[PDB]
A paper describes a structure:
Voltage-gated sodium channels (NaVs) selectively permit diffusion of sodium ions across the cell membrane and, in excitable cells, are responsible for propagating action potentials. NaV1.8, one of the three tetrodotoxin-resistant NaVs, is distinguished from other isoforms by the relatively depolarized voltage-dependency of activation and inactivation, slower inactivation kinetics, and an increased persistent current; These attributes make NaV1.8 principally responsible for inward currents during the rising phase of the action potential, and contribute to hyperexcitability and repetitive firing in the dorsal root ganglion (DRG) neurons where it is primarily localized. Multiple studies have linked NaV1.8 to nociception and chronic pain. Here, we used mammalian HEK293 cells to express full-length human NaV1.8 and determined the structure, with and without ProTx-I bound, by single-particle cryoEM.
Attempts to improve the resolution in this region through 3D classifications steps, masking, and local refinements did not improve interpretability of VSDI but did reveal separate classes (denoted Class I and Class II) showing a distinct repositioning of the VSDI S4-S5 linker and a smaller movement of the lower portion of the VSDI S6 helix; The final apo map and structure was calculated from all particles making up Class I and Class II. Typical of other apo-NaV structures, the apo model shows features characteristic of an inactivated channel, with gating charge residues on all visible VSDs showing ‘up’ conformations and the IFM fast inactivation motif on the VSDIII-VSDIV linker buried in its binding site between S6IV, S5IV and the VSDIII S4-S5 linker. Similar to a previous study, the quality of the map allowed modeling of N-linked glycosylation at several positions (Asn residues 312, 819, 1312, 1328, and 1336) on the extracellular loops, as well as possible cholesterol, lipids, and detergent molecules bound to the transmembrane region; similar to other cryoEM structures of NaV channels we observe density for a bound molecule in the intracellular pore region, which we putatively assign as cholesterol. Density corresponding to VSDI is almost entirely absent in the 2D and 3D classifications, and in the final reconstruction, even as portions of the N-terminal domain (NTD) can be observed at lower map thresholds; this result is consistent with a prior report. The pore diameter through the intracellular gate is ~3 Å, consistent with the conformation of the S6 helices observed in hNaV1.734 and which allows space for the bound cholesterol molecule in our maps. The apo structure shows an unexpected movement of the Domain I S4-S5 helix, and VSDI was unresolvable.
Residue numbers in the entry: 232 to 280, 295 to 407, 651 to 895, 1136 to 1726
């Protein structure tokens, strides 16, 4: 095993710098989080009065508490207390360094980070979103990008190192061009017919579908027999393609043979594999087949390695924890059911747990396993599975990705107005007006009801602004030519936006101001901030670069809209209309009635004694092709995946009560879809995007896209500054009292002493915990005083020794700033210790954050971490441009949601602090879903359309006459936002990895 030992040594060598950066940044952010909000999640709403905790609606967990003005409030009759009960199995808080580090690792991996984000904001405050933004961008996105680049550069180095019958036969080879076109049209229309198989289809519709299927089968069988007759058995069987045609046709007729229709219910849709026959005319489908083929044939070794890894981990987890799961099932199981839904007793569920980990959800299944088993076994297994599992999956993803895709006065006035508009004064005025109007849309919130002055101010501002933007566009018309206006792309965006605004104002001032199309137009006022794309050079360049790839994006989008249609049809065939359930809606929470009391739809009417039995359907299901697509997307983004996976498994037959794990093997459908419409349908898009970017960068000759000329000269100047080989030494003065200090400093031990001192300061700051003993607190305070005093002493010593030559070094200034910041924080804490009127602990905590400079001082002593930070600050301009675009998109969708969903029932996804009522809350929700985290939860409240989930007769809430939303707009909104923010973040990753590649 010496060869593999050396290989892993080299691999860790390539991973050494990235691993150290990850560990160091994680530790720094863990200390920051600990100090900023330690012992804060313990808060719980407690009865005012052997204590009682209120529970969040739809959940059994206690309702967490905040005390500040911006943190989570508490209902009437309850006062918030610091009860010594950490939330969520008491395994998630910042009460100590270990827990803070685990929470920060979870935030980095984004494994349900939505829950931690919500809890921390609810307890600490709404102004601490900055910490989460910083850890997501600097921590999560950035560190993930460096790990990806490291693997990509590890693989590249590995590659571098490496009679009548005869008459019929004569007539049987017509093979006219019309034949193939007719066959293609036939299959297309067959798929179209099979794509309208819904739940409540009339018997006439069912008969029509049966007739269509049988006649199409007859046509395909006739073509098969006619072709095979045209040749002999020795021929027409030498090709895997016609072999596959034979398999599909024989399966089609064999299924027809049986009178039980679909025995497995997949045979009915097995006839959809022939849709791959469009591959011949579609190179995109051809390359999709090629990537799958390379997955099975080219990288088969890697694929089987991944398979054996998953199988082994699942089997080990089963054999180790199944007995404990069975014995203690009552601890983690839901209140009503007896067994845990996601457990590890049997091999199937253990493999499902391992697959969920590889999908990126392990904290909940680690919590449950810790509760129902030894904590030492759990942590080792889950962490090992996650790190090793996710590493193998990404290694395979990049291996397939590279292996495949890499192998009269009129003229006078015209000129005068041209000169006028060309003026930078007018340009800046227009930019200012656009940026003012963009931000002026944040005040049209739900809470605007109580403030009438803001309404009048906004109305007058918009009325003047639209006229200012009609004048601006009329000055453009009279200045520039009509041809060049209506040929430029941006001039339209402005013309259509102003047209929308003008017709909206016209409808408002005339009648018909409350009609549905006019309201929809008003909803389109959220596009107003979009006018700023043209006036900013960075955003204009970024959007030009994006639009340069729209053709390829659409080409891949079609080939994944078909490959998902296959699965949508197959799912609608497997279970359509079988998701309905009979629930017990007591006050605000429910459980499906036990099979004993109720067994089917009719029983819900016979047993309707209490009037609390409702027969309702899962919000997202496979009733028709549209909802099949929606569920497919929910499973693809790995959000809302569990709920449907429960409804599908608990389903027997139309109009029958769901039963616990009646279909325990229906998880395989979702597993197979995840694999195929995930891994591969994303690999294809990522390959196409990286080829399009390469060809758009090489053809135009301009690299480092997403950057303007000023940013380019800055980027040129920063590169020169970073690589400055020559340096001017500092002469040694003759005076002995300074020569002796210079001799001491020059010795290669001052740096070592400072390094060990800062390391010990880090350890001392780490040792602190929550509710520590007073002796520990006092010794820590004295040690902090000692450390700050010695650092200030040495800094002033060397500053005086170097005279004015101290500031020549770039980072000596940073050292001086951190030292003086420590001194100021100490003297600002000492003065606060007195009366000083009134103060709050959070102020002390934030003031004590200045100690992190003494930790950041270790950067200058790093090996490659300084280089990585240099690359980050070198990419900073491009990332700034793309972030500006992303924030513009976020503003657009925040206004859309803030105008569309202010009246919705607060379900498990939307609560008091994460609604769309106000601009701040809208921004929190939009930032949360920018990672596609919790978007299913935010979508669920608006998928509801009737009782018991709503009260369409609820007073006010006239958006839909009630307090529930419209799926038609909700699905569009959320799907479009997630796709757009996925493309934009992919652009960010491309920028970062191309910069690091340099
Ligand atoms: C959902 C779809 C899942 C899998 C894709 C299967 C592709 C089937 C292609 C049938 C057409 C065929 O037969 O194509 C033969 C031709 C020419 O072949 P020839 O005449 O040169 O010899 O070549 C080709 O285009 C195909 C060559 C590449 C094969 C790619 C697929 C490899 C494995 C996929 C299936 C694995 C099991 C999945 C189970 C899920 C449940
Ligand atoms: C992929 C395409 C379609 C996948 C569809 C889902 C897989 C199961 C299909 C199916 O109906 O399979 C037959 C049964 C279904 O069992 P059940 O859901 O009724 O639950 C058990 C309840 N009891 C014990 C009372 C019978 O399962 C069994 O025989 C277990 C073995 C089924 C193997 C299915 C493999 C599918 C994966 C990819 C292609 C290979
Ligand atoms: C953005 C994200 C990350 C990227 C970081 C990139 C690094 C940027 C700073 C370092 C840098 O690029 O270098 C800037 C210059 C270097 O000058 P030079 O060598 O070119 O001059 C040569 C002069 N000749 C020619 C005379 C020899 O100057 C310096 O390094 C001085 C930098 C001064 C920084 C002061 C910051 C300290 C203040 C606050 C500390 C707060 C601690 C608490 C934290 C709370 C919890 C998080
Ligand atoms: C092939 C890829 C390799 C992948 C990594 C493999 C290496 C790591 C394996 C796992 C090692 C785990 C060691 C600890 C084992 C359990 C020890 C144990 O008894 O639990 C201790 C705690 C649980 O405390 P509690 O009951 O909640 O009580 C609260 C408080 N402590 C009290 O005193 O009342 O629970 C803990 O032990 C706290 C755990 C903190 C975790 C910190 C984050 C780690 C991030 C990820 C690291 C790996 C990367
Ligand atoms: C990358 C692109 C490809 C992969 C991603 C594709 C994702 C597609 C998701 C769209 C699903 C649409 C969907 O499910 O429609 C459903 C909506 C709402 O129906 P309803 O009136 O409540 O009636 C319920 C009944 N069961 C029914 O379906 O009738 O039916 C409606 O009445 C809405 C009509 C418009 C739907 C438009 C959906 C846009 C999806 C955009 C996805 C890509 C984003 C970019
Ligand atoms: C959130 O804010 C509330 C309101 O300020 C805090 O309530 C207060 O909590 C303190 C500490 O538990 C209570 O102090 C004790 O009061 C009793 C008398 O009732 C006294 O004998 C003890 O020596 C001690 O001073 C205080 O009474 C209580 N106030 C009320 C009105 O209940 C709450 O602690 C805060 N929660 C957090 C985690 O900050
Ligand atoms: C919903 O599911 C339940 C349970 O499967 C169905 O209950 C069954 O209903 C029939 C008709 O009322 C009952 O039949 C009668 O049972 C008595 C007692 O055995 C017998 O003396 C009569 O001759 C007759 O067979 C049947 O017993 C009952 N099931 C059980 C287990 O008692 C119900 O009909 C279903 N509803 C629908 C409309 O699907
Ligand atoms: C068991 O009995 C209760 C009580 O009669 C039934 O409640 C009723 O359920 C229907 C369907 O969910 C509700 O219909 C809706 O009412 C709202 C107005 O409240 C209306 O806007 C909707 O268009 C729709 O008609 C109905 O209101 C509700 N009645 C009450 C008093 O809550 C329940 O459906 C029964 N369960 C079964 C399985 O039959
Ligand atoms: C992509 C290519 C295929 C598109 C396939 C498009 O198929 C559209 C149909 O599924 C729509 O069915 P409906 O929503 O009209 O069914 C309603 C049924 N009830 C409510 C009357 C019972
Ligand atoms: C043909 C198939 C040959 C055998 C398997 C070929 C190799 O399949 C690898 C995939 O299963 C790995 O993906 P995961 O299962 O981790 O799912 C992650 C999906 N996202 C996160 C990318 C969407
Ligand atoms: C990474 C380092 C930065 C992390 C995010 C740091 C986020 O800090 C936000 C501060 O505004 C917290 O509030 P303060 O303590 O400044 O003021 C308290 C005022 N009230 C709330 C009591 C009225
Ligand atoms: C361009 C203009 C917008 C820049 C961006 C403004 O910030 C947008 C979001 O970060 C939300 O910021 P908030 O200030 O609403 O954060 C919550 C504060 N309260 C409401 C809790 C006090
Ligand atoms: C279904 O819901 C009803 C209504 O909640 C339950 O009936 C009673 O509801 C009250 C609360 O309104 C509880 O205090 C009682 O304990 C419930 N029990 C009964 C039978 O009166 C009903 O029990 C629920 N059924 C099931 C099987 O959960
Ligand atoms: C870094 C030096 C000082 C310590 C060396 C030991 C290593 C293993 C470190 C890493 C994680 C550390 C632990 C992290 C958090 C806690 C919980 C706290 O309530 C007491 C200290 C304690 C238990 C720490 C002790 C030291 C520790 C175990
Ligand atoms: C029908 C139920 C049991 C689900 C099983 C999966 C079905 C639908 C599909 C998925 C992938 C398919 C295979 C994909 C590729 C090929 C190669 C081709 O040359 C002959 C058909 C064959 C061998 C297919 C057989 C049927 C298949 C296994
Ligand atoms: C609200 C409605 C009425 C607005 C409609 C605006 C439409 C007509 C605009 C928006 C973007 C425009 C395109 C943007 C850029 C170009 C390239 C150039 O060759 C001129 C035509 C063409 C292709 C434009 C055609 C018209 C266009 C599609």
């Amino acid at each position: 095993l010496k060869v593999i030992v050396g290989a892993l040594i080299h691999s860790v060598k390539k991973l050494a710098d990235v691993t150290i950066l990850t560990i160091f940044c994680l530790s720094v952010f863990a200390l920051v989080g600990l100090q900023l909000f330690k012992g804060n999640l313990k808060n719980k709403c407690v009865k005012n009065d052997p204590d009682i905790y209120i529970n969040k609606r739809g959940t059994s967990d206690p309702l967490l508490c905040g005390n500040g003005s911006d943190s989570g409030h508490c209902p009437d009759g309850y006062i918030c207390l610091k009860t010594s009960d950490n939330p969520d199995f008491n395994y998630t808080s910042f009460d100590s360094f270990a827990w803070a580090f685990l929470s920060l690792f979870r935030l980095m991996t984004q494994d349900s980070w939505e829950r931690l984000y919500q809890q921390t904001l609810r307890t600490s405050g709404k102004i601490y979103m900055i910490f989460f933004v910083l850890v997501i961008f600097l921590g999560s996105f950035y560190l993930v990008n460096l790990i990806l680049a490291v693997v990509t550069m590890a693989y590249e180095e590995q590659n571098q190192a490496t009679w009548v019958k005869l008459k019929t036969i004569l007539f049987g080879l017509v093979t006219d061009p019309f034949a193939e076109l007719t066959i293609t049209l036939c299959i297309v229309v067959n798929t179209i017919f099979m794509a309208m198989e819904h739940h409540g289809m009339s018997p006439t519709f069912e008969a029509m579908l049966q007739i269509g299927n049988i006649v199409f089968t007859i046509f395909f069988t006739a073509e098969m027999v006619f072709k095979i007759i045209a040749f002999d058995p020795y021929y027409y069987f030498q090709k895997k393609w016609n072999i596959f045609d034979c398999i599909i046709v024989t399966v089609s007729l064999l299924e027809l043979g049986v009178a039980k229709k679909g025995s497995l219910s997949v045979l009915r849709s097995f006839r959809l594999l022939r849709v791959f026959k469009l591959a011949k005319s579609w190179p995109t489908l051809n390359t999709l087949i090629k990537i799958i083929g390379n997955s099975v044939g080219a990288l088969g070794n890697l694929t089987i390695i991944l398979a054996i890894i998953v199988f082994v981990f699942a089997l080990v987890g089963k054999q180790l924890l199944g007995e404990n799961y069975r014995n203690n099932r009552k601890n983690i199981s839901a209140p009503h059911e007896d067994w845990p839904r996601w457990h590890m007793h049997d091999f199937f569920h253990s493999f499902l747990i391992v697959f969920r980990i590889l999908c990126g959800e392990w904290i909940e299944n680690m919590w449950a396993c810790m509760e129902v088993g030894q904590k030492s076994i759990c942590l080792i297994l889950f962490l090992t599975v996650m790190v090793l599992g996710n590493l193998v999956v990404l290694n395979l993803f990049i291996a397939l990705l590279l292996n495949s895709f890499s192998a009269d006065v009129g003229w006078q006035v015209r000129k005068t107005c041209y000169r006028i508009v060309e003026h930078s004064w007018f340009e800046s005025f227009i930019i200012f007006m656009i940026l003012l109007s963009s931000g002026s849309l944040a005040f049209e919130d739900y809470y605007l009801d109580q403030k009438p002055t803001v309404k009048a101010l906004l109305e007058y501002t918009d009325r003047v602004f639209t006229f200012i933007f009609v004048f601006e566009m009329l000055l453009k018309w009279v200045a520039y030519g009509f041809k060049k206006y209506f040929t430029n792309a941006w001039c339209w965006l402005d013309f259509l936006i102003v047209n929308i605004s003008l017709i909206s104002l016209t409808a408002k001032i005339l009648e018909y101001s409350e009609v549905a199309p006019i309201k929809a137009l008003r909803t389109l006022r959220a596009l107003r901030p979009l006018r700023a794309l043209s006036r900013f050079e960075g955003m204009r360049v970024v959007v030009d670069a994006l639009v340069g790839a729209i053709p390829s994006i659409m080409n891949v989008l079609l080939v994944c809209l078909i490959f998902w249609l296959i699965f949508s049809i197959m799912g609608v065939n497997l279970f359509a209309g079988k998701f309905w359930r009979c629930i017990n809606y007591t006050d605000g929470e429910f459980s499906l009635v036990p099979l004993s009391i109720v067994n089917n739809k009719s029983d819900c009417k016979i047993q309707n004694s209490t009037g609390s039995f409702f027969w309702v359907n899962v919000k997202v299901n496979f009733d028709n092709v549209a909802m099949g697509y929606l569920a497919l997307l929910q499973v693809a983004t790995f959000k809302g995946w569990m709920d449907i996976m429960y409804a599908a498994v608990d389903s027997r037959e139309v109009n029958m009560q769901p039963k616990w794990e009646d279909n325990v093997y229906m998880y395989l459908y979702f597993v197979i879809f995840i694999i195929f419409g995930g891994f591969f349908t994303l690999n294809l898009f990522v390959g196409v995007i990286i080829d399009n970017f390469n060809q758009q960068k090489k053809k135009l000759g301009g690299q480092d896209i997403f950057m303007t000329e000023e940013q380019k000269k800055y980027y040129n100047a920063m590169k020169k500054l970073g690589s400055k080989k020559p340096q001017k030494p500092i002469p040694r003065p003759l005076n002995k009292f300074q020569g002796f200090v210079f001799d001491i400093v020059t010795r290669q031990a001052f740096d070592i002493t400072i390094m060990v001192l800062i390391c010990l300061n880090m350890i001392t700051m780490m040792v602190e915990t929550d509710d520590q003993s007073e002796e520990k607190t006092k010794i820590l305070g004295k040690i902090n005083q000692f450390f700050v005093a010695v650092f200030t002493g040495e800094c002033v010593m060397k500053m005086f020794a170097l005279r004015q030559y101290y500031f020549t070094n770039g980072w000596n200034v940073f050292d001086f700033i951190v030292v003086v910041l420590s001194i100021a924080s100490l003297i600002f804490s000492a003065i606060l210790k007195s009366l000083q009127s009134y103060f709050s602990p959070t102020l002390f905590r934030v003031i004590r954050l200045a100690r992190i400079g003494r930790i950041l001082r270790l950067i200058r002593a790093a090996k490659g971490i300084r280089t990585l930070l240099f690359a980050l600050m070198m990419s900073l301009p491009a990332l700034f441009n793309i972030g500006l675009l992303l924030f513009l998109v976020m503003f657009i969708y925040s206004i859309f949601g803030m105008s569309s969903f202010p009246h919705v029932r607060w379900e498990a996804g939307i609560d008091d602090m994460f609604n769309f009522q106000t601009f701040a809350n809208s921004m929190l929700c939009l930032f949360q879903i920018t990672t596609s985290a919790g978007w299913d939860g935010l979508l669920s409240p608006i998928l509801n359309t009737g009782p018991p989930y709503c009260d369409p007769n609820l007073p006010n809430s006239n958006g839909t006459r009630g307090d529930c939303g419209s799926p038609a707009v909700g699905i569009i909104f959320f799907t479009t936002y997630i796709i757009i923010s996925f493309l934009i973040v992919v652009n960010m990753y491309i920028a970062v990895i191309l910069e690091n590649f340099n």
